[PDB]
């Protein structure tokens, strides 16, 4: 990796675009727990039948699997076999989390967390 | 009682341990409801069909009874007919709480309270 580029080109150094997470003022609750799959940052997380931290996905099998009850929001990534500090309470952004498809709109993203300490609202 | 001892001997006054209960920084919510059976100190409580405070025991039914959900954590002991001031919020110890059998490992003791304000984490 050593060639001093002699040409003439425009380019960007980067583009910073801040990721505000909190949409309210309620209290935050945290815990570390053992992972079962590969988790990104701020991805919604359930618990499988063994007690790991599998990332959240509805429609998992007839009978709903325990991967459908979403529980937490991650804070740092981990491989399968590391333990994950994850959030349990607060008020978080509608668009900073990593969801997946078929869970697009605001009504479904709040219907995931209608009951918990975690609440999801709109930034202004 | 009546006679003092003149001789030479020894003894232990006893021993004392701390029992730590809290493990985090959630808000704490309390309530006193009337109890249905004897409850020890720091025992997990359910609510039966009559609205009383039966101490928690799962596998109670082909539909499970409303004792199968756990709600509170007691703070002072009370017999049947007395009311029990219990906890609804906070973060509590894994080991100081009075569980019972078949609920011994770590993962079950959090899958009881995945959803509420109450969260049960390990002391370091």
């Amino acid at each position: 990796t050593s060639l001093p580029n002699y040409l003439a080109g425009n380019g960007d150094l980067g583009s910073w675009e801040p990721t505000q997470i909190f949409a309210g003022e309620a209290d935050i609750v945290t815990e570390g727990g053992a992972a079962g799959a590969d988790i990104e940052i701020y991805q919604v997380i359930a618990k499988n039948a063994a007690g790991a931290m599998v990332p959240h996905d509805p429609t998992a099998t007839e009978v709903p699997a325990p991967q459908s009850v979403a529980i937490g929001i991650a804070a740092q990534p981990a491989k399968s076999g590391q333990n994950v500090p994850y959030y349990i309470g607060g008020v978080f952004n509608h668009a900073a989390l990593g969801w997946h498809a078929s869970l697009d709109t605001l009504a479904k993203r709040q219907a995931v967390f209608d009951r918990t300490n975690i609440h999801i609202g709109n930034l202004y | 009682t009546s006679l003092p001892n003149y001789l030479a001997g020894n003894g232990d006054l006893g021993s004392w341990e701390p029992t730590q209960i809290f493990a985090g920084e959630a808000d704490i919510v309390t309530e006193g409801g009337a109890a249905g059976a004897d409850i020890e100190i720091y025992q997990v409580i359910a609510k039966n069909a009559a609205g009383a405070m039966v101490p928690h025991d799962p596998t109670a039914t082909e539909v499970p009874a409303p004792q199968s959900v756990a709600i509170g954590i007691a703070a002072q002991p009370a017999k049947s007919g007395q009311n029990v001031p219990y906890y609804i919020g906070g973060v509590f110890n894994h080991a100081a709480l009075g569980w019972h059998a078949s609920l011994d490992t770590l993962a079950k003791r959090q899958a009881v309270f995945d959803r509420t304000n109450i969260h049960i984490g390990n002391l370091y």
Binding site: - | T1, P4, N5
Partner: protein, 50 residues
């Protein structure tokens, strides 16, 4: 005595365990940086050649 005995307390016997610094004696320099990372450069210059 009677109802219960009296007591003279001596000093508290405090067994206290430490872990003294044996490995830190080779780490003299302290750097309190506010930035993110710490850059090093190592250069090896092979001269011993015919």
């Amino acid at each position: 005595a009677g109802l219960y005995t009296t007591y003279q307390l001596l000093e508290v016997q405090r067994k206290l365990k430490t872990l003294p610094a044996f490995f830190l004696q080779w780490f003299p320099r302290q750097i309190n940086f506010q930035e993110d990372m710490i850059a090093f450069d190592k250069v090896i210059q092979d001269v011993t050649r015919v």
